[PDB]
């Protein structure tokens, strides 16, 4: 039995909030905090969530519960279909945490932090290539970005972004075709590009635009938020916010002792205990998330920003990729460890984007050992009676599985799949004989070209707030860390964001073909959709998980002290 999305979205406290005082928040991370206040240089969702009170790495635009752009935030955006342009207008009194003005150059500088390879960003994508002159700037063929212009100059509050083709998702946040953050140029201009990621000016002592500012950052541990006097909007209620990382093992004990008022991104296996904790209300909603299984299919060319599917591996055969997916027992694993929060995935598009999901799409949600064996049989891999593993040309079907650290069931689940691949005759061993730590895993997947010492890994995503998956799978993007390149898949991705897909009936059919083709080609295998839950202490006022709530950090407060 799986739990329905009938969790309470908001905790409506009858108690009035005080002045201030001190809120204590934590994020469940077994890895140390990675402090990076520039959106272009940060790859993890862990710190992106922790940077919330500071502006969410300096987010600009406001949003309704459907992630669509609305007016009234730090900046406003307007589209023009026939000219193929976006116009971004910053607020006249938009300021950094040091009092200095946020200008048009600050927004453009964000594009440079990703496009200019000297900063070492992993966020380059085919989506960004749609901006006129950005590809030429990215390759170094130009000195500036021609598609980005300033109607009122670099000091002004207006920026114009020129596109080659208009995209449907442009009315929605997380589209990726244009950026939504600003970076402090004046403060960071004297720092060499290759030094910017490790500079104290982007890590421990930065400048922000949000309601709170980091008074102190304890590297790899915590943030000390205090109210920002130069914030354009409402004055926050609280005196301070402390945002800390908390290990999986210590999370439940931290709740019992009231050390934290809120813990975000808790694993499904702990919900059993969290629900029994009085003094806390457990909120919840459909996670904008997917976990899936990756195959290592090639390498990434960094100089030319292109994924090359050229790795010499038995995983280049389609029948081998499908069988390994069909061998897994995701459903059995879910029913045993996830407390009804994880539903086995049928495709790549999560239930949260309900409009573009289809029950017609059959995937790998149901285990089929017989079909797995057959697919391997009719492909040329014959089982060896002696060893118990399939062989071809005398080469044994031996693969490396880079499994990852997680909850207390992480090591169990990893071995669970290994035994299933054992049943079909595929020899699978763990990477270096032990589970991989999150921080070093990300570096191993994102850094070019790169790694050839793994075959199977598990990817977990805090997905973009827009259904399109160009920033995950497009040929130019490093985030495609399996490094596949398929003409049909590219066409499917492009057709999803084509001019015809402005028509939602057409875009619906483009998503359905994409999901069916991704399942068939089996470059990646959809594992889980998740339902997220959040324990909130009963003293907290104005707390909500609603995606439409914009002034959340300013309106949030407490009813009592410790």
């Amino acid at each position: 039995k799986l739990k329905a999305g009938n969790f309470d979205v908001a905790y409506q406290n009858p108690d009035k909030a005080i002045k201030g005082g001190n809120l204590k928040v934590a994020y469940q991370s077994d890895s140390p905090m990675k402090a990076q206040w520039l959106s272009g240089l940060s790859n993890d969702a862990t710190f992106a969530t922790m940077s919330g009170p500071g502006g969410g790495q300096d987010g600009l635009f406001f949003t309704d519960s459907g992630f669509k752009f609305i007016k009234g935030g730090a900046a406003d955006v307007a589209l023009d279909k026939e000219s193929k342009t976006a116009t971004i207008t910053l607020r006249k009194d938009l300021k950094w945490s040091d009092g200095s003005e946020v200008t048009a150059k600050d927004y453009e500088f964000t594009y440079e932090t990703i496009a200019n390879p000297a900063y070492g960003s992993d966020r380059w994508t085919d989506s960004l290539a749609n901006i006129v002159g950005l590809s030429d700037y990215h390759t170094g063929k130009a000195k500036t970005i021609s598609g980005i212009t300033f109607p009122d100059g670099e000091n002004g509050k207006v920026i114009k972004v020129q596109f080659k083709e208009m995209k449907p998702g442009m009315t929605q946040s997380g589209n990726g075709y244009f950026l939504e953050t600003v970076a402090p140029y004046q403060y960071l201009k004297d720092v060499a590009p290759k030094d910017l990621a490790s500079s104290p000016k982007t890590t421990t002592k930065p400048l922000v635009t949000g309601p709170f500012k980091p008074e102190n950052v304890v590297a790899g541990e915590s943030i000390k938020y205090v109210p920002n006097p130069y914030y354009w909007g409402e004055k926050p209620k609280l005196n301070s916010i402390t945002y800390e990382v908390v290990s999986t093992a210590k999370s439940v004990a931290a709740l019992s002792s009231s050390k934290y008022d809120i813990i975000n991104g808790m694993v499904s296996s702990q919900y059993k205990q969290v629900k029994n904790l009085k003094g806390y209300k457990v909120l919840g909603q459909q996670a904008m998330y997917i976990s899936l299984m990756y195959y290592n299919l090639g390498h990434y060319d960094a100089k030319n920003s292109i994924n090359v599917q050229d790795r010499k591996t038995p995983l280049q055969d389609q029948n081998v990729r499908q069988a390994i997916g069909y061998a897994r027992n995701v459903a059995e694993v879910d029913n045993k460890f996830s407390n009804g929060l994880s539903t086995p995935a049928n495709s790549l598009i999560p239930p949260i984007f309900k409009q573009f999901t289809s029950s017609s799409v059959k995937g790998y949600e149901k285990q089929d050992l017989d079909k797995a064996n057959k697919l391997l049989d009719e492909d040329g891999w014959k089982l060896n009676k002696s060893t118990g593993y399939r062989e071809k040309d005398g080469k044994e079907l031996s693969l490396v599985y880079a499994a990852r650290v997680g909850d207390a069931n992480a090591e169990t689940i990893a071995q669970n799949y290994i035994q299933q691949w054992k049943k079909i005759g595929v020899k699978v061993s763990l990477y270096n004989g032990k589970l991989m730590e999150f921080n070093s895993w990300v570096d191993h997947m994102t850094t070019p070209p790169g790694a050839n010492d793994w075959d199977i890994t598990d990817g977990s995503w805090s997905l973009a707030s827009e259904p399109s998956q160009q920033d995950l799978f497009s040929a130019a993007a490093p985030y495609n860390f399996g490094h596949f390149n398929d003409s049909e898949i590219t066409k499917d991705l492009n057709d999803i964001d084509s001019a015809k897909s402005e028509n939602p009936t057409y875009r619906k059919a483009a998503f359905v073909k994409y999901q069916e083709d991704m399942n068939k080609k089996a470059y990646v295998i959809p594992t889980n959709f998740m339902l997220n839950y959040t324990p909130v202490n009963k003293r907290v006022v104005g707390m909500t998980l609603d995606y439409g709530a914009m002034n959340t950090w300013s309106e949030i407060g407490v009813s009592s002290a410790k």
């Binding site: 991370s29 993890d44 939504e180 694993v267 499904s268 997680g406 909850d407 977990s460």
Partner: peptide, 9 residues
């Protein structure tokens, strides 16, 4: 807003 690597939850 943008895609991000998550720990596994």
């Amino acid at each position: 807003r943008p895609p991000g690597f998550s720990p596994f939850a």
